[PDB]
Amino acid sequence: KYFMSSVRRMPLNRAKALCSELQGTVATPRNAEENRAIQNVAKDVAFLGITDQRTENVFEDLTGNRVRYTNWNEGEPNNVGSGENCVVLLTNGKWNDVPCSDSFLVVCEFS
């Protein structure tokens, strides 16, 4: 897997479209090593290819596969307010669930 980060921020729909344009997908760390690699390529908070849109509190990748490895920041996921169904990687490498309509950098994943 190869990881590339975007320079501008955008909502998840646009993030997905960007990675897909070059035939990749939004980055999904499957272990601590990939998590670190993604963190390093990201210069700020960035979207991961994980969501609990289909079923609340059931996080899966963009292809429907339930994720096994997680690295939730203390207190997360909390689905605050009207809801948070997307996921971002913070600058310390931990994850936080956020509204999919909010804008962050995106890290794309390629094989």
Ligand X SMILES: OC[C@H]1O[C@H](O)[C@@H](O)[C@@H](O)[C@@H]1O
Residues of this chain that bind ligand X (CB under 6 A): 76, 78, 80, 84, 96-98
Nearer to a second copy, 13 or 55 (CB): 13
Q: State the DSSP H helix or E strand holding residue 58, giving kind and residue range, or none if neither.
A: none
Asked if 108 is part of the footprint of a second copy (rule: CB under 8 A), the reply reads yes
What's the rounded Cα separation, in Å, for the pair 61 and 7?
23
Nearer to ligand X, 37 or 84 (CB): 84
Phi first, then psi, for residue 93 (nearest 5°) are 85, -10
Asked if 67 is part of the footprint of Ca ion (rule: CB under 5 A), the reply reads no
Q: Min. distance of Cβ 20 from ligand X in angstroms?
A: 25
Token pair of 44 as six digits: 């700020």
21: burial class by Cβ within 10 Å (0-12, 13-18, 19+)?
exposed
Question: Which one of 11, 12, 13, 20 is in contact with a second copy (CB under 8 A)?
Answer: 20
Give me the residues that bind a second copy (CB under 8 A), please: 2, 4-8, 18, 20-24, 108, 110
